[PDB]
Swiss-Prot record:
Subunit structure, interactors included: Interacts with FRA1, GRX3 and GRX4.
One GO cellular component term noted in the UniProt record for this chain: iron-sulfur cluster assembly complex
A GO MF label: iron-sulfur cluster binding
Name this protein carries in UniProt: BolA-like protein 2
Phylogenetic lineage: Eukaryota, Fungi, Dikarya, Ascomycota, Saccharomycotina
UniProt function note: Involved in the regulation of the iron regulon in response to decreased mitochondrial iron-sulfur cluster synthesis. May be involved in mitochondrial organization and biogenesis.
Compartmental location: Cytoplasm; Nucleus
Gene name of this polypeptide: BOL2
Family per similarity comment: Belongs to the BolA/IbaG family.
Major site of localization recorded for this protein: cytoplasm
Record keywords: Cytoplasm, Nucleus
Gene Ontology BP terms: cellular response to iron ion; intracellular iron ion homeostasis; iron-sulfur cluster assembly; negative regulation of transcription by RNA polymerase II; protein maturation
Further information: Present with 2050 molecules/cell in log phase SD medium.
Length: 93
């Protein structure tokens, strides 16, 4: 009600610099306070995931006020590491 999952993506995009990709997914059924979104950016470069949360709150402080509890997963291939990515990008139909 107070926040829209679809609208959230737009807010996030406008709440942060045009990152590589922004995705908003609601973990709870339909609408709810719980939110789960994933975004990839260099913002996580040289900074820990926990640190990003603090920056995100400042960037989207109003979002937190509207949202009782939400998550914002962020990665930049760093977590994956060089190891063996084997690309494995997307999949065939």
């Amino acid at each position: 009600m107070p926040v829209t999952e679809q609208g959230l993506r737009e807010r996030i995009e406008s709440a942060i610099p045009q990152v590589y990709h922004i995705i908003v997914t609601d973990l709870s059924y339909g609408c709810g306070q719980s939110f789960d979104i994933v975004v990839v950016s260099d913002f996580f470069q040289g900074k820990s995931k926990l640190m990003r949360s603090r920056a995100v709150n400042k960037a989207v402080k109003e979002e937190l006020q509207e949202i009782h509890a939400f998550s914002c997963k962020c990665y930049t291939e760093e977590e994956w590491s060089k190891i063996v990515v084997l690309e494995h990008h997307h999949h065939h139909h």
